[PDB]
Amino acid sequence: MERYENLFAQLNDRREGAFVPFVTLGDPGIEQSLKIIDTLIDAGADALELGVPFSDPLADGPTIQNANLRAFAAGVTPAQCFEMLALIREKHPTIPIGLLMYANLVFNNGIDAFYARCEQVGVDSVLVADVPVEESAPFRQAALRHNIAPIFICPPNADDDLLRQVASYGRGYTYLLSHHLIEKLKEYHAAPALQGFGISSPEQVSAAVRAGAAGAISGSAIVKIIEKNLASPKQMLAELRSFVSAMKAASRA
Amino acid sequence: MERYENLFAQLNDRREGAFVPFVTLGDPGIEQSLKIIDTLIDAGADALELGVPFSDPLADGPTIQNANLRAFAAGVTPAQCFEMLALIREKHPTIPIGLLMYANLVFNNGIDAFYARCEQVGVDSVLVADVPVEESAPFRQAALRHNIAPIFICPPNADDDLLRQVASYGRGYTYLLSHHLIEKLKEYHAAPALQGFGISSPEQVSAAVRAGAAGAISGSAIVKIIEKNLASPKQMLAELRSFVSAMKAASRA
Amino acid sequence: TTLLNPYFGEFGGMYVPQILMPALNQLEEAFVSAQKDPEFQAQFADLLKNYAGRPTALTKCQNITAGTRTTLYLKREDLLHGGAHKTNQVLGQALLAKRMGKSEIIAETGAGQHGVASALASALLGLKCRIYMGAKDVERQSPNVFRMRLMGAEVIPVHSGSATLKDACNEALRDWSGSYETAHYMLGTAAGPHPYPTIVREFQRMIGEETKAQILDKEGRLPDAVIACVGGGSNAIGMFADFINDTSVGLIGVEPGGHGIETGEHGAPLKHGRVGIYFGMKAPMMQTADGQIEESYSISAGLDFPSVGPQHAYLNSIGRADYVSITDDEALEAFKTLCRHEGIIPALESSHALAHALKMMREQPEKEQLLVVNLSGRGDKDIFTVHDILKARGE
Amino acid sequence: TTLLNPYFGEFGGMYVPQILMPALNQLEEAFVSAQKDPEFQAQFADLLKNYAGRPTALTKCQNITAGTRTTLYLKREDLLHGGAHKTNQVLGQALLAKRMGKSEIIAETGAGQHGVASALASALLGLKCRIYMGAKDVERQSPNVFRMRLMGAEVIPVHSGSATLKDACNEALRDWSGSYETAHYMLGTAAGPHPYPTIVREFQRMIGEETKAQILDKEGRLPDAVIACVGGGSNAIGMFADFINDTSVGLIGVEPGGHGIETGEHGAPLKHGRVGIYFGMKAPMMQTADGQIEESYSISAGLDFPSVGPQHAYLNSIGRADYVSITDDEALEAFKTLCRHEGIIPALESSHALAHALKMMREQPEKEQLLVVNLSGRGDKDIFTVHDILKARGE
């Protein structure tokens, strides 16, 4: 599988950017999370970034910390996250699915076994939030051995060595934090850039693509709609569908 | 006046020891204390030792500390103690009256003025509890200038220098704490010894006199009868009269 | 590229988000520069001497050892300004912050001692100090919170997650990732990402240096063993560092056994946890079977960091240091023993080290041994804790 | 006959009942012998060094004095084992007791600090310690009572009189008069009958000795003034003693002004009391017009001895030392100032000395002056007191 490569080639043919929502697996429960993910896809998500609930989500802001807490209140575990992932791939065969993980959850039962499990359920990429490129060797090797793309964050201040490492070591896409960087990454033949962090309106999706990014990632904005509508699951889905549709339309040429 | 000299000469003529009660002036109030003192005299007290209530009666045991507290609860002050003393002497012209004082009360308004006040009201002696003989010079000088006998404690372990100081500096009587000492004091021409501390039965009055003391002092035993009978002043007096009569009879040849 | 090795064998590293790497690399270069700078060394020494009160005493405990062949000395970190060893390293870290041109200090704290240490150093050195403390800890440590506020520090209660030390650590790191150009993160133990395990050791190593000089002066030879409690690893590594190359000197680290290892309610991850990656490092930690990070439990809240410094894990792996544990009850008994027989009130943390030395002596009372316990702090702070336990079970 | 002069000018003496004279004379001869004995001096020095942590630091306070011509150093008795200067003299007095073959210690205590100091010295030196404390003080000083009991001391609540410090003193002396063959009375200040004002000074004089050496090392000349709080007089006389003959060095003693001299609610007998005879001595005291002994009032219970050491009264009379007072509010402000600007929590007692130095600086900020404050103790013990006041009036 080369799901990201296939996706970007098709989007390029259409002069279109990717729109990629982020949500937490099992927020606010397993069945509703499965419905939410299907709604994001039916509304036009090009790819998914999915978090696995972790006790100490250091690199996440309050909205996403709260999502993890909701998922823990439902008794969600990594094992149940992987059963969910298998069902999602079985329903949607071509959509790229990326995980946002913390290092402990990857390392816990053995790094290789983790990436093997990802391959078995049909995940395409993994971003390990708290592994910097300088210490990523065992992660990215294991990823690649299991046909999993290792994803790296490229910070807005990145120096030249860091840009070269990111361009060399990453695959699938480059996670670019919210025009110089975009051109350098392209210069160094990096995986295509997706812009993430604080993307919450259609206007920011268009702006990212116009700057030369291949697409945009949005999470807080999406998970906010979850949090806001806990009492009304059916309205939750309707609001998610509206927001994703609008955001995806902004990526179209 | 030489009231102690007159008393001991008369007692000697009668082959008799002195019995000397100790009470706190104004315990449990002024009027009842005056009655108590008159009862002690009418029952056969040869002399009196009288305490002036002081805030911190270091050298006194709980019975006498409690007596001071009762006197303070009645609002008794040194000035009222001196008015009492004047009335007692006016009623009883020959009985020796000795004060037990603390140094602050003597020093407070001027040492000379204190002993002048004693002379004016007709007190015969003063024992300053917390002035050792080694630092007594200004006290005993002022006493003697005002015809007041300075009284010193002679401890049971007293060394030879201390016995000589006590014998030289004291007048009226020597306060001997509860047969070797008695003979040495007589050898050094000390004032006659009165034995004090824990004298509570007739048998101990006789024993003191037989040892060669001129008499005995008793306080706790007396003040106990006060404390015990606070609710019944009339019975208080009757019990005091009985106890003093019995104790005085033990001093008779 | 780093200047220094971030690992001790397999353990340690710099497992932080990419955006925090420049802060760590800046810190490391500042440290390496500082360590070669005699003026920095002179300034740090001057504060330690004239402000904090170094050198600290080394006290013999003949009343405790009478009738045995143990000789016991206590390294008196309890006499350091602030009442625990933490003061040493906060002063160096504050000087480092000034070296880097930083005007603000961020710190985390669990039981409040590191919070107070950071606040006092910041007040002395004219730094604006903000301290993250889990809301549950803020509630159970009001004396320490009020000390911090008296010293001009801003105390920020953390409600996220379990509202305890881990959450405080996370909030401190989040803040730092956005403020490191003007703020230094004053991490409170010999753990966390590189360069902090190295820095904190180096800024605590005078404990062992002094101990070596003092024991040589008093006994004419090195100790048979030096014993220190291990919560995160700072006082123990400070005692141990100068003896590592003296291969005949035992290094014994004492983790809290809590209610007992078998009960699961303990804080002994080095010997009874499992290696994970968290707190920016690869180290033994307290964690669930599927990798969620858990808590350490001890009567002593200062020993509750649910992992351990990576140098300790490494020293254990190669057999250079040995790690053991002491229960709450054992620590309480050592606390009472030192009060009664030497007139020293030890911190409950430190009492774990003392309890193990007492065990070494009592188990083999005719074994010739010269022991130093690191008395990491005084236990004025623990007297109500100890009183309430001794009350609850009669007394 | 005594070996030494019991008076300082008119003040002092030995105004005790006859039966206590042999105990005082025994003590005096033991002291005179001890002072000439290099082995006793060596043993005392060894305890001070290796147990108590002497010498104590001398800390400059540039953050407080910035922009003025005052240079301020704090003599750091707060870093002494036990957290106050009292430890120095209890160790010498315990050694004296052993010299005399005594196996028991009697002590009085008001706010509990002397009780704890006596207990820790007794525990170290293997003495059976009994402590008299007024029942009202026992109630308001539970942390200190539990410290004493942890250290093996028997704490005896006194119900007689007003159940406060005077009553505790009386009960201790009563006990001693019957037990002095086997018990030593460990009096807690430079007051009471001779030889105690002399003894306590001599066993505190290393404060000033060290201060002299340290100030000469750091500044190359003696202080313009040394400033110390005065409750009974021990820390102040310890600071002052070695400078008495340096006639250019001011000696400023600070009594508690409480709510203010004019209110009558203060503890400033040296300057605002009247000479009396009590506590075995002739000295200024708090007393009624007809001579009943009263209480001193201060926010700081450690400053509540209602008289003052006779050497202070003498040094004032001849103009060698000057005495002033500081109110509760002034002391609170100095307490907050030191916390905030130096990261040192001072005892409220000590804060009176600091408040007066702050006054010396602020009133004349362009006056060149080199000041040493005796920081007699640390103020961990005072944080709830300070918190509750700062709360009561908003904050």
Ligand SMILES: O=C(NCCOP(=O)(O)O)c1ccc(OC(F)(F)F)cc1
């Ligand atoms: O990602 C961040 N913020 C917002 C995006 O995450 P989320 O809001 O959960 O999607 C974010 C914040 C801090 C950070 O560094 C560190 F963890 F070290 F503090 C890394 C990422």
Ligand SMILES: O=C(NCCOP(=O)(O)O)c1ccc(OC(F)(F)F)cc1
């Ligand atoms: O993709 C993520 N969040 C969703 C997009 O951001 P937002 O829309 O602001 O929630 C996301 C990605 C990485 C991350 O951690 C680290 F940066 F450390 F790798 C945290 C959150």
Ligand SMILES: O=C(NCCOP(=O)(O)O)c1ccc(OC(F)(F)F)cc1
């Ligand atoms: O007199 C004593 N006991 C009993 C007799 O007095 P009291 O029971 O009041 O008549 C007594 C007890 C202790 C004492 O010495 C000192 F004050 F220093 F402690 C002096 C006298």
Ligand SMILES: O=C(NCCOP(=O)(O)O)c1ccc(OC(F)(F)F)cc1
């Ligand atoms: O005469 C006194 N008490 C009454 C007799 O003793 P007791 O019968 O035992 O109460 C008495 C005499 C002296 C004294 O103090 C001191 F000894 F210091 F001078 C205290 C009590």
Ligand SMILES: O=C(NCCOP(=O)(O)O)c1ccc(OC(F)(F)F)cc1
């Ligand atoms: O143990 C720690 N702090 C000690 C706090 O001491 P106290 O105030 O006494 O609880 C501690 C704090 C941070 C840390 O690493 C990282 F920053 F990555 F999270 C590791 C350990």
Ligand SMILES: O=C(NCCOP(=O)(O)O)c1ccc(OC(F)(F)F)cc1
């Ligand atoms: O001030 C005194 N003790 C200090 C207690 O200190 P603390 O425990 O801090 O209240 C103190 C104690 C006894 C004394 O003389 C005498 F024994 F005659 F009564 C004079 C002063």
Ligand SMILES: *Cc1c(COP(=O)(O)O)cnc(C)c1O
């Ligand atoms: C915080 C603390 C400890 C534990 O920290 P380490 O970093 O493991 O040394 C030990 N002792 C005391 C007195 C403490 O305050």
Ligand SMILES: *Cc1c(COP(=O)(O)O)cnc(C)c1O
């Ligand atoms: C007891 C005490 C004082 C007062 O006693 P002095 O004998 O007047 O020195 C002062 N400071 C502290 C810290 C104390 O504990």
Ligand code: NA
């Ligand atoms: Na730990």
Ligand code: NA
């Ligand atoms: Na006073």
